[PDB]
């Protein structure tokens, strides 16, 4: 993403996806 | 046994890195082919399976990520710390733990691809210390340790 905080929040979103699928 | 979980994290992450790299070859970083049937090894392998699925589904995000990782790796700690802290500012769950593991794996792989060797141990230390100081180890301990990931 544009900034590292943006990157971290995108990873939070991906982690929630993982938590919902596995 | 928060400290126990924190120590277990090292072996979990090492096994995760090994198996994720191995299945990514079934389609390179020598440092990821060495130094591993214990409980934590098995947990790492399972998590590496789910992490490979996620890495294929979110390839572009994980590649875009590395634009902030300087090619010399002089800011490895800064990059890791800031991104993971943003990751866990909104809470902790197992999925986010797996995401942190995959983030560490890609950071370790990329610093090698940029010609910095012998850095995988340090990314492992990054992961262990972050999970300890950001209450991730306490959380995992509160859910029964790393072994509870096998469910
Ligand atoms: Cu690069």
Residue numbers in the entry:
A (entry chain B): 68 to 89
B (entry chain A): 23 to 49, 56 to 64, 68 to 182
Task: Tell me what the authors wrote about this structure, in their words.
Mitochondrial poration by pore-forming BCL-2 Effectors, BAK and BAX, initiates apoptosis. Its apo structure exhibits a stable globular conformation incapable of executing poration. Autoactivation is mechanistically similar to direct activation: binding of exposed BH3 of BAK or activators to the activation groove induces conformational changes in the electrostatic network at the bottom of this groove destabilizing helix α1 to initiate BAK unfolding.
Here we show that autoactivation involves binding in trans of the BH3 helix α2 of active BAK to the activation groove of dormant BAK. To stabilize and crystallize autoactivated BAK, we disulfide-tethered BAK BH3GGC peptide to engineered G184C BAK (herein referred to as BAK BH3-BAK complex). We determined the crystal structure of this complex to 3.1 Å resolution, which revealed 10 unique complexes in the asymmetric unit. Cu2+ acts as crystal contact coordinating two BAK monomers. The GGC linker is largely invisible in all 10 complexes suggesting its intrinsic disorder and minimal contribution to the structure of the complex beyond tethering. The BAK BH3 peptide forms a helix bound to the activation groove of BAK, similar to previous BH3-bound complexes of BAK. In apo BAK helix α1 electrostatic network is stabilized by 2 hydrogen bonds between α1 R42 and α3 D90 and 2 hydrogen bonds between α1 E46 and α5 R137. Of the 10 autoactivated BAK here, seven feature 2 hydrogen bonds between α1 R42 and E46 and α2 N86; one has only 1 hydrogen bond between α1 R42 and α2 N86; and two (those with lowest b-factors) show no visible density for this network. The destabilized conformation of the electrostatic network is unique to autoactivated BAK providing the structural basis of BAK triggering by BAK BH3.
